[PDB]
Design a protein around this ligand. Structure first.
Ligand SMILES: CO[C@H]1CC[C@@H](n2c([C@@H]3CCCC(=O)N3c3ccc4c(c3)OCCO4)nc3cc(-c4c(C)noc4C)ccc32)CC1
Length: 114
């Protein structure tokens, strides 16, 4: 219902705001690799992986038809990390910071799109 360029122009700054977060975004900039990490149970627990680079690609390639699909992918990323990692880990606390940032950025944008 939305043109892919309008979605990208409006939404990409909110993704850029996540990428700008250092150290917090670094573990989220590429898909979780259970082979490199030695965690063969990762895809048992996380059935639908998501990360910043995959969200960026879906914006870049026109895979979102409406902006709540983008918001849902961002929250899928967050919920995957909170689900798999322990609350004392960097990834878990880093994820919480990304959620704080995203909440503030996505707010005016979703209003502007609808
Ligand atoms: C810049 O490419 C690298 C980024 C980080 C690396 N990676 C590591 C490493 C494994 C070595 C031992 C260590 O200590 N790692 C580490 C952990 C956190 C870091 C960090 C390094 O450096 C950047 C800031 O935070 N574990 C990770 C866990 C996840 C993850 C998420 C999200 N959901 O579920 C899981 C499980 C994702 C990436 C991970 C992988 C390539």
């Amino acid at each position: 219902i939305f043109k892919p360029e309008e979605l990208r122009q409006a939404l990409m700054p909110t993704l850029e705001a996540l990428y700008r977060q250092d150290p917090e975004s670094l573990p989220f900039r590429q898909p979780v690799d259970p082979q490199l990490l030695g965690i063969p149970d990762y895809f048992d627990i996380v059935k639908n992986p998501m990360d910043l680079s995959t969200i960026k690609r879906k914006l870049d390639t026109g895979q979102y038809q409406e902006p709540w699909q983008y918001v849902d992918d961002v929250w899928l990323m967050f919920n995957n990390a909170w689900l798999y990692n322990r609350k004392t880990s960097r990834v878990y606390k880093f994820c919480s910071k990304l959620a704080e940032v995203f909440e503030q950025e996505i707010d005016p944008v979703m209003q502007s799109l609808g």
